[PDB]
């Protein structure tokens, strides 16, 4: 929840990578481009 | 939760890499570009 | 949780690398560009 | 948790490398650029 | 947890390298640039 006051640029460029608890299987691709953009996964 | 007051640039550029607890399998690609951007995984 | 008061630039550029507890398998790529950006993994 | 008061630049540029406890396998690439950026892994 | 009071520049530029306990295998690249940046691993 956003319950704060006075904060400028709060977590402005924060990035959180993979979080897994338990017995989980993840295969996939997540990409965000905010603007020539090459984001490429070629397994 | 955001329950704070007076904080400027709180965790502005924070990055958290992989967090796994248990028996988890992750294969994947996560990329964010905020702006020529080459982000490339060529396994 | 963010329960603090008066902190400027709290963890502004903090980076946390891989954290694994248990029996976990991770193969992947995580990249964030905040701005010519070349971030490249060519295994 | 952030439960502190009066701290300026708390852990402003802190970096935590790999932490593994148990039987874990990690292969991957984590890079953050906050600004010509060349971050390259060419195994 | 951050449960402190009065600390300025607490661990401002602290760096923690690899920590492994048990039977773990890590191959990878972690780089953070906060600003021409060349960070290069060419095994």
From Swiss-Prot, chains A, B, C, D, E:
Q: Where in the cell is it found?
A: Cytoplasm
Name the domain of life: Eukaryota
Q: Where is this region: Disordered?
A: 1-31
User: Where do the TM regions start and end?
Assistant: none
Q: What does this protein do?
A: GTPase component of the eRF1-eRF3-GTP ternary complex, a ternary complex that mediates translation termination in response to the termination codons UAA, UAG and UGA. SUP35/eRF3 mediates SUP45/eRF1 delivery to stop codons: The eRF1-eRF3-GTP complex binds to a stop codon in the ribosomal A-site. GTP hydrolysis by SUP35/eRF3 induces a conformational change that leads to its dissociation, permitting SUP45/eRF1 to accommodate fully in the A-site. Recruited by polyadenylate-binding protein PAB1 to poly(A)-tails of mRNAs.
Q: Which family does it belong to?
A: Belongs to the TRAFAC class translation factor GTPase superfamily. Classic translation factor GTPase family. ERF3 subfamily.
The record makes one more remark, namely:
[PSI+] is the prion form of SUP35. [PSI+] is the result of a conformational change of the cellular SUP35 protein that becomes self-propagating and infectious. This conformational change generates a form of SUP35 that assembles into amyloid fibrils. [PSI+]-aggregates sequester soluble SUP35, resulting in defects in faithful translation termination by read-through of translation termination codons. [PSI+] can be cured by GdnHCl and by deletion of the molecular chaperone HSP104, which is required for [PSI+] propagation. Present with 78900 molecules/cell in log phase SD medium.
| The protein's assembly and partners | Heterodimer of two subunits, one of which binds GTP. Interacts with polyadenylate-binding protein PAB1, and TPA1.
Comment field on protein domains = The prion domain (PrD) is a Gln/Asn (Q/N)-rich domain, which is unstructured in its native, soluble form, and which forms a parallel in-register beta-sheet in its amyloid form.
Its name, as the record gives it, is Eukaryotic peptide chain release factor GTP-binding subunit
Give the species this sequence originates from: Saccharomyces cerevisiae (strain ATCC 204508 / S288c)
Q: Which gene encodes it?
A: SUP35
**Range of the intact protein held here:** 4 to 115 of 685
């Amino acid at each position: 929840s956003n319950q704060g006051n006075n904060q400028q640029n709060y977590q402005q460029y924060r990035q959180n990578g993979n979080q897994q608890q338990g017995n989980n299987r993840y295969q996939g691709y997540q990409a965000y481009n905010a603007q020539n953009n090459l984001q490429g996964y070629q397994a």
